[PDB]
Ligand binder design. Sequence first.
Ligand SMILES: *[C@@H]1O[C@H](CO)[C@@H](O[C@@H]2O[C@H](CO)[C@@H](O[C@@H]3O[C@H](CO[C@H]4O[C@H](CO)[C@@H](O)[C@H](O[C@H]5O[C@H](CO)[C@@H](O)[C@H](O)[C@@H]5O)[C@@H]4O)[C@@H](O)[C@H](O[C@H]4O[C@H](CO)[C@@H](O)[C@H](O)[C@@H]4O)[C@@H]3O)[C@H](O)[C@H]2NC(C)=O)[C@H](O)[C@H]1NC(C)=O
Ligand SMILES: *[C@@H]1O[C@H](CO)[C@@H](O[C@@H]2O[C@H](CO)[C@@H](O[C@@H]3O[C@H](CO[C@H]4O[C@H](CO)[C@@H](O)[C@H](O)[C@@H]4O)[C@@H](O)[C@H](O[C@H]4O[C@H](CO)[C@@H](O)[C@H](O)[C@@H]4O)[C@@H]3O)[C@H](O)[C@H]2NC(C)=O)[C@H](O)[C@H]1NC(C)=O
Ligand SMILES: *[C@@H]1O[C@H](CO)[C@@H](O[C@@H]2O[C@H](CO)[C@@H](O[C@@H]3O[C@H](CO[C@H]4O[C@H](CO)[C@@H](O)[C@H](O)[C@@H]4O)[C@@H](O)[C@H](O)[C@@H]3O)[C@H](O)[C@H]2NC(C)=O)[C@H](O)[C@H]1NC(C)=O
Ligand SMILES: *[C@@H]1O[C@H](CO)[C@@H](O[C@@H]2O[C@H](CO)[C@@H](O)[C@H](O)[C@H]2NC(C)=O)[C@H](O)[C@H]1NC(C)=O
Ligand SMILES: *[C@@H]1O[C@H](CO)[C@@H](O[C@@H]2O[C@H](CO)[C@@H](O)[C@H](O)[C@H]2NC(C)=O)[C@H](O)[C@H]1NC(C)=O
Ligand SMILES: *[C@@H]1O[C@H](CO)[C@@H](O[C@@H]2O[C@H](CO)[C@@H](O)[C@H](O)[C@H]2NC(C)=O)[C@H](O)[C@H]1NC(C)=O
Ligand SMILES: *[C@@H]1O[C@H](CO)[C@@H](O[C@@H]2O[C@H](CO)[C@@H](O)[C@H](O)[C@H]2NC(C)=O)[C@H](O)[C@H]1NC(C)=O
Ligand SMILES: *[C@@H]1O[C@H](CO)[C@@H](O[C@@H]2O[C@H](CO)[C@@H](O)[C@H](O)[C@H]2NC(C)=O)[C@H](O)[C@H]1NC(C)=O
Ligand code: NAG
Ligand code: NAG
Ligand code: NAG
Ligand code: NAG
Ligand code: NAG
Ligand code: NAG
Ligand code: NAG
Ligand code: NAG
Ligand code: NAG
Ligand code: NAG
Ligand code: NAG
Lengths: 128, 430, 48, 101, 127, 127, 127
Amino acid sequence: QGQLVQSGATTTKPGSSVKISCKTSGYRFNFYHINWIRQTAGRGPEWMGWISPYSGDKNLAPAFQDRVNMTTDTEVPVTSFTSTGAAYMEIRNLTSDDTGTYFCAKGLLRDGSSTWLPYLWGQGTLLT
Amino acid sequence: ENLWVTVYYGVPVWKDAETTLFCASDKHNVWATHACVPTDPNPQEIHLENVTEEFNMWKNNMVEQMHTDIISLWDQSLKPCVKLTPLCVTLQCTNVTRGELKNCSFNMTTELRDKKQKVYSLFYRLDVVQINKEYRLINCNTSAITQACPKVSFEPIPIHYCAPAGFAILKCKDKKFNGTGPCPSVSTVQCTHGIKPVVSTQLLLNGSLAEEEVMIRSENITNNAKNILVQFNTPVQINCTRPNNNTRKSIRIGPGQAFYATGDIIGDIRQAHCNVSKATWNETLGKVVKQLRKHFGNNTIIRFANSSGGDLEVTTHSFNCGGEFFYCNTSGLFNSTWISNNDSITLPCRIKQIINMWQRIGQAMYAPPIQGVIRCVSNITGLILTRDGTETFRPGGGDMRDNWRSELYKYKVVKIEPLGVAPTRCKRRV
Amino acid sequence: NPQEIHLENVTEEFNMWKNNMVEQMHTDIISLWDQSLKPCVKLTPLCV
Amino acid sequence: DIQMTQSPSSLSASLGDRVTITCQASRGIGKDLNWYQQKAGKAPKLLVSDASTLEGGVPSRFSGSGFHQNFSLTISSLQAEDVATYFCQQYETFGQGTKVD
Amino acid sequence: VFLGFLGAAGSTMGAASMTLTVQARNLLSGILTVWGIKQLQARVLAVERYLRDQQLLGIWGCSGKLICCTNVPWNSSWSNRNLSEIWDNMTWLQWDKEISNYTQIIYGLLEESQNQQEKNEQDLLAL
Amino acid sequence: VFLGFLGAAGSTMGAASMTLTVQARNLLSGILTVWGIKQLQARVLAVERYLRDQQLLGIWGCSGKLICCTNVPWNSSWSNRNLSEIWDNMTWLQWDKEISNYTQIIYGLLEESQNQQEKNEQDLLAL
Amino acid sequence: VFLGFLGAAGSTMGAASMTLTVQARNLLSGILTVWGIKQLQARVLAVERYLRDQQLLGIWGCSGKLICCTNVPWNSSWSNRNLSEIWDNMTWLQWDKEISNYTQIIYGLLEESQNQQEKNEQDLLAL
Ligand SMILES: *[C@@H]1O[C@H](CO)[C@@H](O[C@@H]2O[C@H](CO)[C@@H](O[C@@H]3O[C@H](CO[C@H]4O[C@H](CO)[C@@H](O)[C@H](O[C@H]5O[C@H](CO)[C@@H](O)[C@H](O)[C@@H]5O)[C@@H]4O)[C@@H](O)[C@H](O[C@H]4O[C@H](CO)[C@@H](O)[C@H](O)[C@@H]4O)[C@@H]3O)[C@H](O)[C@H]2NC(C)=O)[C@H](O)[C@H]1NC(C)=O
Ligand SMILES: *[C@@H]1O[C@H](CO)[C@@H](O[C@@H]2O[C@H](CO)[C@@H](O[C@@H]3O[C@H](CO[C@H]4O[C@H](CO)[C@@H](O)[C@H](O)[C@@H]4O)[C@@H](O)[C@H](O[C@H]4O[C@H](CO)[C@@H](O)[C@H](O)[C@@H]4O)[C@@H]3O)[C@H](O)[C@H]2NC(C)=O)[C@H](O)[C@H]1NC(C)=O
Ligand SMILES: *[C@@H]1O[C@H](CO)[C@@H](O[C@@H]2O[C@H](CO)[C@@H](O[C@@H]3O[C@H](CO[C@H]4O[C@H](CO)[C@@H](O)[C@H](O)[C@@H]4O)[C@@H](O)[C@H](O)[C@@H]3O)[C@H](O)[C@H]2NC(C)=O)[C@H](O)[C@H]1NC(C)=O
Ligand SMILES: *[C@@H]1O[C@H](CO)[C@@H](O[C@@H]2O[C@H](CO)[C@@H](O)[C@H](O)[C@H]2NC(C)=O)[C@H](O)[C@H]1NC(C)=O
Ligand SMILES: *[C@@H]1O[C@H](CO)[C@@H](O[C@@H]2O[C@H](CO)[C@@H](O)[C@H](O)[C@H]2NC(C)=O)[C@H](O)[C@H]1NC(C)=O
Ligand SMILES: *[C@@H]1O[C@H](CO)[C@@H](O[C@@H]2O[C@H](CO)[C@@H](O)[C@H](O)[C@H]2NC(C)=O)[C@H](O)[C@H]1NC(C)=O
Ligand SMILES: *[C@@H]1O[C@H](CO)[C@@H](O[C@@H]2O[C@H](CO)[C@@H](O)[C@H](O)[C@H]2NC(C)=O)[C@H](O)[C@H]1NC(C)=O
Ligand SMILES: *[C@@H]1O[C@H](CO)[C@@H](O[C@@H]2O[C@H](CO)[C@@H](O)[C@H](O)[C@H]2NC(C)=O)[C@H](O)[C@H]1NC(C)=O
Ligand SMILES: *[C@@H]1O[C@H](CO)[C@@H](O)[C@H](O)[C@H]1NC(C)=O
Ligand SMILES: *[C@@H]1O[C@H](CO)[C@@H](O)[C@H](O)[C@H]1NC(C)=O
Ligand SMILES: *[C@@H]1O[C@H](CO)[C@@H](O)[C@H](O)[C@H]1NC(C)=O
Ligand SMILES: *[C@@H]1O[C@H](CO)[C@@H](O)[C@H](O)[C@H]1NC(C)=O
Ligand SMILES: *[C@@H]1O[C@H](CO)[C@@H](O)[C@H](O)[C@H]1NC(C)=O
Ligand SMILES: *[C@@H]1O[C@H](CO)[C@@H](O)[C@H](O)[C@H]1NC(C)=O
Ligand SMILES: *[C@@H]1O[C@H](CO)[C@@H](O)[C@H](O)[C@H]1NC(C)=O
Ligand SMILES: *[C@@H]1O[C@H](CO)[C@@H](O)[C@H](O)[C@H]1NC(C)=O
Ligand SMILES: *[C@@H]1O[C@H](CO)[C@@H](O)[C@H](O)[C@H]1NC(C)=O
Ligand SMILES: *[C@@H]1O[C@H](CO)[C@@H](O)[C@H](O)[C@H]1NC(C)=O
Ligand SMILES: *[C@@H]1O[C@H](CO)[C@@H](O)[C@H](O)[C@H]1NC(C)=O
């Protein structure tokens, strides 16, 4: 029930790497995963991976395992049930095939069968 | 949908409350630690994962409760003791062979009500006032006076405050936790750690250190009328001694009533004082001056001065050493100006005997003299500064509850409320 | 009506020399003695 | 170290007008601001303490509000007895004052 | 796992609800001197607060229960949250805040629903 | 209607028997200074008298019940009144006076009827 | 026969088990002066020890029971004695000594066996 603001549209060229931010608020950051999903021109949407700010655990698709740098900071507590977090994302071998809009998404629940499901999303970032 | 409320008994939920705490511990000492429940040898500390609690050391009621408990135990430990009101008589005093301690002879009541006795006793300057020269004890025109029973000890004994059943205490594991705010790591305990009720001034003695860095706490640090509670991370050692070899002399002033008088000094007459390592005190003032810039500026200069006025208790490092109440000049510790970028300090300490302890005007206490040579070793683990309304910080104190607040910041009293109503698709039969 | 129940078949170990009732009675009397002398007059003026 | 900018320095209004005075702080002070009223040849009188708490005995026409850095003192329906100098207070620093006419 | 007293304070309402006896044990035992009267006042306070919770369980037909199912249907005005977004999302601490206002109302409904239930059972056995 | 604490004191035994939780709530909460010891003595007295009534309900198999049905058949020596001339004629105040003598006897019958009932249930489940 | 309070102390475990209410009655009633504080301390002590036994019965699903059957199977490590050599041979005094060590273990087993039993009953009624 909070915002997940992201970075700006940083357009580079193939070969380089790009780091996109995702600063959270209005909710306990360490209680939900942070999913990363992209919708490029050439395919539809593709799920990249999520990371658990609490456990530090990371699970990402084999199509992006050897490309994605997925790290998180540690929440700065605001109130008892509110904090402010930050999630980072990078890509290694960047090309023009990877041009699209990228988002971060907060997990759906804290338990059950839909724990990590991308429920609360950011706004998007335009790549190369 | 089909949702009926269901009752749950024993749900991890609590509220901020304030209850009556009770003591636990491990000669009788003033803090009646023998009347406390034995501290359990297995101290259960449960860590509250994922929990984040709000603390506020400046509203904590444990402090306000501890402060009246000590006062209450002080008054309890002086009822059975002898009343020195017959001592409020004219004294004939001469110097001792500068001019601090006196030698005073008076007419005193014996065990028979129709017989007198011309006894003499030594008194420090701070305990008498003028009218051979004619003197008088300081308290006589304000308050009655009660001699401390010479079998109770002023030794700070570790006291543990425990909450009743159905209440809990919430610690704060945050190594860099300042005064207020939401503690990220929290745990629950049944009693507090071993808190020594050290009555001190300016320099917090024998207390608990800070892990990691040296902390600094205050309500409004921008408010000059709020004492800064700086807590060290490395203790700087201070050694105090009264080197005179004093002697105690019993004087029967009535049936079963014996006033313990200072007999005479056996050997050299010397000054009482305290030593701190000038090197270790230099590096500790630096650690303090560093965290002082985080709130006032990387370029502004931080200056230390001595007190600017007040009574003896607040203008000096007031404390107690082996049973005698010292009052140390601290001008040699707070005389530095810090820019944007064997050794020993010695403090002249005086000694008093008619002490009013807290701020009560009406209940004075005569501390009986301690035989032998007094020396004690203690750590100064905290500090109580006061910035001038260049930002200059000068020591101070007086309100003894800041001492208790310096050890009770980690804790908070909460009330367990285990009844919880929540909906599920459950219903009972007919 | 003082109820005394007899414990058939029971056999208990006693030790009158460790009994705490004794140590408790002795301080109770002392405690009641001291209680019964607080309101009474002090004869310290008699020490003449 | 703090700086209180009180505005305006002087104003004039008729009987029954709404008068508002502002005090800006150079940095966050929470709600630690107090408002006073001082007439000619008299000692100040506390109107509002803690930014928005009306002192006892002060007529209800007075009111204050503010937090962080923007504060205000309001006199709903000015009267003849209200002619004085009003100033805010942050600890030992005061505003420069406003002379009402 | 054994988290300890209030160990599941930050866990979800479903997780903590399996660790009820943990908090139920230490509610009555724990996890004329000055201290003498200070301790006696606490020993009486612990019993009074305990019997008050037991008194409410008794007049709700829940005496002896840790998880007790009732007859009062959940009014969505109290909380219009889904079941899966409560027991697997919220902590009992958050839940007690969101139901702060309506708690006194539910406590009355659970009472008459029990005096009418046993009044009905007195008729079911009148034959 | 909501009559209040002891509101149905003058009503018939049947009417008052529907307002039991009313009187059950205020039995434990309510509707070294002089006052300090005077209040502590009252706080302990309230708990003792409460647990005594709860103790009797427990050893009668009625713990948690407000209306509790038993196995002791009504001896007409206690009161040879008809059912309709009691629950629709008398007030609980009058009834407590008429059964003043026989009350201690019934209290014993309700006790062994419960220790034999559970001793029987221990045999019913011995297979 | 009526043996009295602890009358069956020397009788067999089976005989004494029929006289439970005898010992259950006198557990709460009985069979600033010096005596004033001495009596108040005893009146509070009696309630605390009583509610502790009641607290254990509550979290074992035995609240209100004198003879209570459970789900914990008897571990022969605790006592490898035959049924007929216990209830018709031993006295409760001897039995409490032989099970001195294992008593704290059984008390925990009886607790989780109840929180899992009601957690299961909450699912049996989830339909
Ligand atoms: C404190 O707060 C944090 C944050 O809210 C809580 O952390 C969350 O806990 C819940 C439950 O414990 C987690 O939900 C479960 O998620 C697992 C998915 O994990 C699996 O996959 C991972 C990636 O492949 C893998 O890392 C896991 O492997 C184990 O090892 C890692 C090592 O890093 C360890 O950290 C993990 O915890 C794993 O144990 C694992 O293979 C999912 O499988 C669960 O679903 C099953 O169980 C539920 C019932 O619970 C059932 O309904 C399902 O059908 C399925 O059977 C379950 O969804 C969640 O992921 C955690 N993290 C979040 C929310 O960010 C923490 O529990 C709190 N602790 C306390 C004490 O309060
Ligand atoms: C605080 O002030 C009190 C006074 O109020 C001091 O007490 C007095 O101290 C002096 C010493 O400073 C004492 O004087 C000494 O008395 C000794 C006792 O002798 C008496 O008794 C014999 C009988 O056996 C008589 O013959 C004799 O005349 C005395 O009456 C003497 O032995 C001492 O003599 C020494 O001095 C003389 C002259 O100087 C020498 O010739 C001797 O050789 C010898 O060296 C001395 O006279 C006095 O008695 C004390 N009074 C009381 C009441 O006790 C405290 O000392 C002082 N304390 C401090 C710390 O300042
Ligand atoms: C800060 O804490 C210090 C240590 O925790 C305090 O030092 C303590 O001070 C007291 C009194 O000043 C001392 O008690 C005295 O002990 C001597 C004899 O002690 C020696 O002999 C015993 C044998 O029983 C032996 O066990 C000791 O180790 C000593 O070798 C007595 O003669 C006195 O009458 C008095 O009882 C403590 O011993 C002393 N502890 C230590 C470790 O030095 C210090 O006072 C505290 N500071 C403040 C301001 O409170
Ligand atoms: C103890 O010695 C001091 C120091 O000599 C004396 O102080 C003097 O007191 C007189 C008053 O009688 C003053 O006029 C002097 O100026 C003081 N001198 C100093 C240096 O301060 C004191 O009087 C002596 N006391 C006794 C009882 O002899
Ligand atoms: C004063 O100095 C230190 C406090 O930092 C104490 O000495 C250390 O005490 C801890 C725990 O008590 C031990 O683990 C260390 O080994 C001690 N260090 C040394 C060099 O002995 C000392 O007890 C303090 N004295 C007080 C607080 O009275
Ligand atoms: C302080 O003075 C006392 C006496 O006033 C000294 O005590 C004496 O100690 C020796 C042993 O060294 C004994 O033989 C004497 O009998 C003691 N005298 C008394 C009156 O008890 C003590 O030694 C002195 N201590 C210091 C440090 O000066
Ligand atoms: C305070 O006193 C302590 C002990 O009385 C001093 O510690 C001693 O220091 C010397 C020199 O380093 C060592 O040889 C001793 O072994 C130390 N004593 C102990 C018990 O460890 C300390 O130096 C004094 N400090 C000050 C500032 O006076
Ligand atoms: C004095 O301290 C109080 C409480 O620590 C401060 O009040 C907070 O101020 C911040 C920033 O203005 C607000 O975001 C909080 O909501 C305030 N909390 C409360 C409880 O009032 C206050 O700002 C401080 N004042 C000064 C002058 O430093
Ligand atoms: C004691 O009393 C006598 C009585 O005259 C007097 O002369 C003497 O000075 C008194 N002593 C003291 C020390 O006051
Ligand atoms: C007590 O006497 C002192 C003498 O030092 C004097 O200054 C003070 O005013 C007196 N105080 C009272 C309360 O009489
Ligand atoms: C303590 O830290 C919190 C967050 O870091 C901060 O908001 C608060 O002002 C700090 N306390 C003081 C007295 O500065
Ligand atoms: C503080 O220092 C000044 C000058 O060094 C001195 O005059 C004053 O007496 C000192 N105050 C105290 C209480 O030591
Ligand atoms: C403290 O010491 C300084 C010099 O060391 C001295 O000037 C000052 O007077 C002393 N304090 C007092 C109260 O005398
Ligand atoms: C919900 O509560 C309101 C008042 O709080 C009541 O008017 C309404 O009838 C309730 N609805 C249900 C379905 O119980
Ligand atoms: C309870 O009432 C208060 C009234 O001030 C309101 O602010 C609060 O939002 C209410 N609680 C809920 C959960 O709506
Ligand atoms: C009624 O009570 C008397 C003694 O009070 C008893 O002798 C009689 O058997 C009882 N009758 C019934 C039917 O219980
Ligand atoms: C109870 O016994 C007394 C004996 O004095 C008798 O007067 C009274 O009538 C009896 N009660 C009833 C209801 O008969
Ligand atoms: C009996 O207890 C032991 C430990 O005391 C345990 O290891 C064993 O599994 C238990 N056996 C049964 C049948 O419960
Ligand atoms: C309980 O443990 C003690 C350990 O000293 C042992 O002597 C005793 O025999 C044990 N109890 C039983 C019934 O075996």
